[PDB]
Design a protein around this ligand. Structure first.
Ligand SMILES: [Ca+2]
Lengths: 145, 145
């Protein structure tokens, strides 16, 4: 916590504290609400997938480490490991294991991992251009305080 | 689908629904046409490569899992796995396995995976600066509706 508070002094010389402006928007509003809505999305879809193994018979083919179970939440752990935008999950053709599960999985992960974070990246790129006077102004405001 | 519709309420307070602006352009026009043209590119080049094993004798040297076959489309699966911009595919010198196949492969993947998505990234970076009045305007339009 003290090395966090080290930011308190890091808002004076050398134009330090510019982050202290943008954290006013990203931590409280933008990244906050984004992580909320995305967490809700992914937990809902997690319930979906853990319910979508009985038809499209129980199989969650090994990732690119939960096996078929019913315990309480190990599903969520291994499934989140799967949701990691890590390795461009496998493609299918002439399905043998769960058939309609895979298409839902791929379209969902494309929705959430090719648009949502990109939505937020574009949001950053557009919102950063708001600093007009609050550079010298917050500088002398630091002076004052 | 209900958790998709959760975006319907997520367009009011806290300036939610900014995505609902950009999705007007990226989902229907930009990312759409880009994925279309890129899919066409890659499937054409896939036909090319699966036809380019007989001279430059049959060999698709193990990636950085289809072996020489003739079945129907396993080519497409393993080849797409190869097309994943995953690991900066191997370099060659003093060729022994297919000779002119590798140079075509590398120049194609450089074309499609160092320019096309970068073309679209620059397109994003330039198109995001269009919000002039439709922030407060779409806000009060949400109000109205
Ligand atoms: Ca890696």
């Amino acid at each position: 916590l003290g090395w966090m508070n080290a930011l308190y002094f890091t808002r004076g010389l050398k134009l330090t504290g510019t982050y202290s402006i943008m954290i006013q928007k990203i931590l409280f509003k933008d990244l906050f609400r984004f992580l909320l809505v995305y967490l809700l999305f992914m937990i809902g879809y997690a319930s979906a997938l853990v319910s979508l193994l009985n038809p499209c018979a129980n199989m969650k083919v090994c990732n690119e480490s939960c096996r078929d179970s019913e315990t309480f939440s190990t599903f969520l752990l291994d499934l989140f490991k799967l949701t990691i935008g890590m390795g461009d999950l496998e493609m299918l053709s002439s399905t043998k294991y769960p058939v309609v599960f895979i298409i839902l999985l791929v379209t969902y992960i494309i929705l959430t991992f090719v648009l949502l974070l990109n939505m937020l990246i574009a949001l950053m790129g557009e919102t950063v251009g708001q600093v007009s006077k609050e550079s010298k102004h917050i500088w002398k405001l630091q002076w004052a305080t």
